[PDB]
C-alpha cells in the first residue's frame, strides 16, 4: 500500500503519494470559517492561516486542512495509508505530540512519521551533512545538519519570506500608480514577482545601470491586455532578503544568518558546511540568488575557504520530493510509529521514534 506525503507550509500545502516525482495537490494553507479550505476559502468569511512562520498554531483549522487534503484533494481513505508529515525546525515538543495524536485518534492512520523539512531537502541533494537555506512563504531558516540530524542550537530563523516580498512589490507598484485590491490583483503581483524579479549580483551597480538605461526593463501583459513595465523593482524586491531594512526590519539578511549559523557549529565541521550550502523552498527560486549568496559568503568567510552553493532546479518542492523518496524505502518505513505502538504509548512516542 502506498504511503502519503504531506508537507505543510505557511503558505501552501504540498501533498501526494510516496513514489511520485511531484506532489499531486498544491493549494493555499488557508481555512475560512462551516469550512472552506484552499482556493475555495480565498474566493469566499474570516480567513485564518493555521501555520504561522512554519509552526502550527491553530489545531482546529489544521485538522480541517488535513481533512481537506485526504478526502477532497487526494481522495483517499486515511486509515489505509501510512502518512509522512513534515515539521519546521525548532518545532515545540507539544506541537509534534498534538500532530501525532491527531493523525492517530482523528484520522486513524496505520502508521506515521514526522520529519524535519530541511533534512528531507538535504537527502534529496544526496547529502547527510550540510547547511540548508529554506525560504518559503512565511519563514526563512538556516538549518545546519550533521550526518542526518539538524543541530538545533545552531538553527537561525528570519521571519521574512515570499509573502513579505509580495507585499513589498505590491507597495512599490501601488506607489507608482497601480492598484491591487481584487483576488486577481494580489495574485497578479505574486505572478509578476515570480516571473520578473531577480537577485542582483551587485545591488549598487544594478541600481546605477537601471538609472542610466532601459536595458533592465521588462513588460508584463495584464489579463485585460494592458501592459506594465518594471525596472529596478525587479531586483529591489528580493534584495530585501539581503537587506531586511527595505521593509523596516532591523535584522540580519540571509547571507549573514547563513554565516552566523555556520559559526555556531563545531569548528570541526565548518569546512564541510561552507562547501555544502543547499537552497530549498520557493523563495530561493529567484535567478541570481545562488551567485549572490556565493559572493556574500566568500566575503564573510576565511580567505582560504572553499564555498559552494547547491541550488537544484526542482528545489521549490525539494522537501516534498525528499519525503516521497524516503517514504518509499523499506529501511525508512521500519522507523515509523505504528498504530499499535501509539495505543500502547500515546503521543509522546513521537520523541523516541522521530528525530
Amino acid at each position: 500500500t502506498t504511503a502519503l506525503v504531506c508537507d505543510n507550509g505557511s503558505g501552501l500545502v504540498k501533498a501526494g503519494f510516496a513514489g511520485d516525482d511531484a506532489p499531486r495537490a498544491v493549494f493555499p494553507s488557508i481555512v475560512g470559517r462551516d469550512s472552506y479550505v484552499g482556493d475555495e476559502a480565498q474566493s469566499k468569511l474570516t480567513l485564518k492561516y493555521p501555520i504561522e512562520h512554519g509552526i502550527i498554531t491553530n489545531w482546529d483549522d489544521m485538522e480541517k486542512i488535513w481533512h481537506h487534503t485526504f478526502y477532497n484533494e487526494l481522495r483517499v481513505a486515511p486509515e489505509e495509508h501510512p502518512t509522512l508529515l513534515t515539521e519546521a525546525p525548532l518545532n515545540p515538543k507539544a506541537n509534534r505530540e498534538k500532530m501525532t495524536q491527531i493523525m492517530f485518534e482523528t484520522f486513524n492512520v496505520p502508521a506515521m512519521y514526522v520529519a524535519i523539512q530541511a533534512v528531507l531537502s538535504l537527502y534529496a541533494s544526496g547529502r547527510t551533512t550540510g547547511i540548508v537555506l529554506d525560504s518559503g512563504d512565511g519563514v526563512t531558516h538556516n538549518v545546519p545538519i550533521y550526518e542526518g540530524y539538524a543541530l538545533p542550537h545552531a538553527i537561525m530563523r528570519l521571519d521574512l519570506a515570499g509573502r513579505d516580498l509580495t507585499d513589498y512589490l505590491m507597495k512599490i507598484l501601488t506607489e507608482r500608480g497601480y492598484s491591487f485590491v481584487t483576488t486577481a490583483e494580489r495574485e497578479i503581483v505574486r505572478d509578476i514577482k515570480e516571473k520578473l524579479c531577480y537577485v542582483a549580483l551587485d545591488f549598487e551597480n544594478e541600481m546605477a545601470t537601471a538609472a542610466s538605461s532601459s536595458s533592465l526593463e521588462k513588460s508584463y501583459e495584464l489579463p485585460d491586455g494592458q501592459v506594465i513595465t518594471i525596472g529596478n523593482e525587479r531586483f529591489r524586491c528580493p534584495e530585501t532578503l539581503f537587506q531586511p531594512s527595505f521593509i523596516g526590519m532591523e535584522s540580519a539578511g540571509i547571507h549573514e544568518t547563513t554565516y552566523n549559523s555556520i559559526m555556531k557549529c563545531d569548528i570541526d565541521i565548518r569546512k564541510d558546511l561552507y562547501a555544502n550550502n543547499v537552497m530549498s523552498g520557493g523563495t530561493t527560486m529567484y535567478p541570481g540568488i545562488a551567485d549572490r549568496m556565493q559572493k556574500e559568503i566568500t566575503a564573510l568567510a576565511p580567505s582560504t575557504m572553499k564555498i559552494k552553493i547547491i541550488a537544484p532546479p526542482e528545489r521549490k518542492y525539494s522537501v516534498w520530493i525528499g519525503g516521497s523518496i524516503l517514504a518509499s524505502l523499506s529501511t525508512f518505513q521500519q522507523m515509523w510509529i505504528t498504530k499499535q505502538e501509539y495505543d500502547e504509548a500515546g503521543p509522546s512516542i513521537v520523541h523516541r521514534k522521530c528525530f
Binding site: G16, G19, D20, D21, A22, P23, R24, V26, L122, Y123, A124, S125, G126, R127, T128, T129, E147, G148, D191, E194, K195, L196, S215, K218, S219, Y220, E221, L222, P223, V227, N276, M285, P287, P312, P313, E314, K316, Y317, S318, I321, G322, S324, I325, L326, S328, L329, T331, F332
Partner: protein, 226 residues
C-alpha cells in the same frame, strides 16, 4: 578491498572492477569494513562515500544518501562524505579506480504531470523536413537547439523562449509553413503563461537593437540547461 554499490531505482546493487560510473547515477562506496567483513576499528577511520553523478536526479541521490545513513546507523564510527563528479577528494580518488562514462539509469519515482512554473529558457528550431512534396506545413518538426546565435540558420524559423519574452526569428530563406508553426508555438507558450509574456516576430538581419545581447544573456542565465 572497498565495496562499491550502484543505485538502481530503490535498490543498491554491488559492482566489480572495472568501475565505470554513469554520470547520471549515484554510487555508494563502502570503506567501513575490514577484510573479513567486520566493522573497522574507529582508529582506522571507517568511511562511506556517496558519489553524485553530475546528471543524477533527486531519487538516485536520496536513495544513495539514505543507504549511507543506514550504514552509519549500524556503525556510528563511520564518517560519511559526499563526492561530486569531477571534484572528488584526493582521498576518495585514492581508494577507488574509476572512470566516468555518459549514461543514466532512470530513477524509481513515477512521473506526475505538474508544471513547476519557474523561469526556464529554451530555443526551438521549427522546420518542415520535406520540401520536395510542395508543402512547408505538413512535415513540421520542433527541435530544441542550444540557445546561441550559432544555432540560428537562414533556412528555418527559431522560437526563442525567454520565459516572459518570446521571440520568433524568421530566417531569410525559411518557408511560409515554418513561420505559421513558429507563431503558433509562441502563441501556445504565451497562452500557457496566462498571456503575461511579450511576443515578437523578428526577421533575419532586421533584429531589434536589444536582440543579440538578449540571446547571450539567455544562454548564460538559463536556470535549467538541458
Amino acid at each position: 578491498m572497498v565495496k562499491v554499490l550502484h543505485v538502481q531505482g530503490k535498490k543498491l546493487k554491488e559492482v566489480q572492477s572495472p568501475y565505470n560510473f554513469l554520470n547520471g547515477d549515484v554510487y555508494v562506496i563502502d570503506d567501513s569494513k575490514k577484510p573479513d567483513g567486520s566493522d573497522k576499528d574507529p582508529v582506522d577511520s571507517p568511511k562511506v562515500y556517496i558519489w553524485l553523478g553530475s546528471k543524477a536526479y533527486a531519487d538516485d541521490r536520496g536513495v544513495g544518501a539514505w543507504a549511507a545513513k543506514m550504514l552509519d546507523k549500524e556503525n556510528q564510527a563511520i564518517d560519511i562524505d559526499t563526492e561530486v563528479e569531477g571534484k572528488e577528494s584526493a582521498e576518495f580518488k585514492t581508494i577507488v579506480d574509476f572512470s566516468v562514462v555518459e549514461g543514466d539509469t532512470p530513477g524509481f519515482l513515477k512521473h506526475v504531470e505538474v508544471n513547476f512554473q519557474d523561469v526556464d529558457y529554451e530555443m526551438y528550431r521549427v522546420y518542415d523536413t520535406d520540401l520536395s512534396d510542395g508543402s512547408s506545413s505538413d512535415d513540421i518538426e520542433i527541435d530544441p537547439v542550444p540557445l546561441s546565435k550559432n544555432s540560428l540558420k537562414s533556412e528555418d524559423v527559431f522560437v526563442i523562449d525567454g520565459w516572459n519574452d518570446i521571440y520568433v526569428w524568421i530566417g531569410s530563406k525559411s518557408q511560409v509553413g515554418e513561420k505559421a508553426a513558429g507563431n503558433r508555438l509562441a502563441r501556445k507558450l504565451d497562452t500557457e503563461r496566462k498571456r503575461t509574456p511579450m511576443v515578437y516576430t523578428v526577421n533575419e538581419g532586421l533584429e531589434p537593437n536589444g536582440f543579440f545581447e538578449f540571446l547571450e544573456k539567455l544562454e548564460q542565465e538559463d536556470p535549467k540547461k538541458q
